[PDB]
Design a protein around this ligand. Structure first.
Ligand SMILES: Nc1ccc2ncc(Br)n2c1
Ligand SMILES: Nc1ccc2ncc(Br)n2c1
Length: 125
């Protein structure tokens, strides 16, 4: 069974736009999105579709790039570090749910390297 997907809006939570968050959407996310290994990560894991009935028994903080994209588009985040944390959660979830050497892990490893390359230098305020 699937839990509800992570929120992409929250009226109690303050919004912010920064040069770094704009870059995270326009450059980092939109470039990673086009990578040949991005497709498993473009939407929340559908455990019913994918026949992964234990996915959410293992992964308690799910995250994916579709959620991140909507959060960025909604100015959901306070700062770039909060968004970067969601990317890191997405990658770590992949390593937790699977095991070294799996195809999906090789995909996450490649995307993580590209992500780090792109966030190594961010714009300034
Ligand atoms: N679409 C996805 C996303 C993440 C993930 N971890 C293991 C499998 Br199979 N996964 C499939
Ligand atoms: N064994 C599986 C099942 C689903 C799936 N989506 C991406 C990868 Br890599 N996947 C591997």
């Amino acid at each position: 069974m699937n839990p509800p997907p992570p929120e992409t809006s929250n009226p109690n939570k303050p919004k912010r736009q920064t040069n770094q968050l704009q870059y995270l959407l326009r450059v980092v996310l939109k470039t990673l999105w086009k990578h040949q290994f991005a497709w498993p990560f473009q939407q929340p894991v559908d455990a019913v579709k994918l026949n992964l009935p234990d996915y959410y028994k293992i992964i308690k903080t799910p995250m994916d790039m579709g959620t991140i994209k909507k959060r960025l588009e909604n100015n959901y985040y306070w700062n770039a570090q909060e968004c970067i944390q969601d990317f890191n959660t997405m990658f770590t979830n992949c390593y937790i749910y699977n095991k070294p050497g799996d195809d999906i892990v090789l995909m996450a490893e490649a995307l993580e390297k590209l992500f780090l390359q792109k966030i190594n230098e961010l714009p300034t305020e």
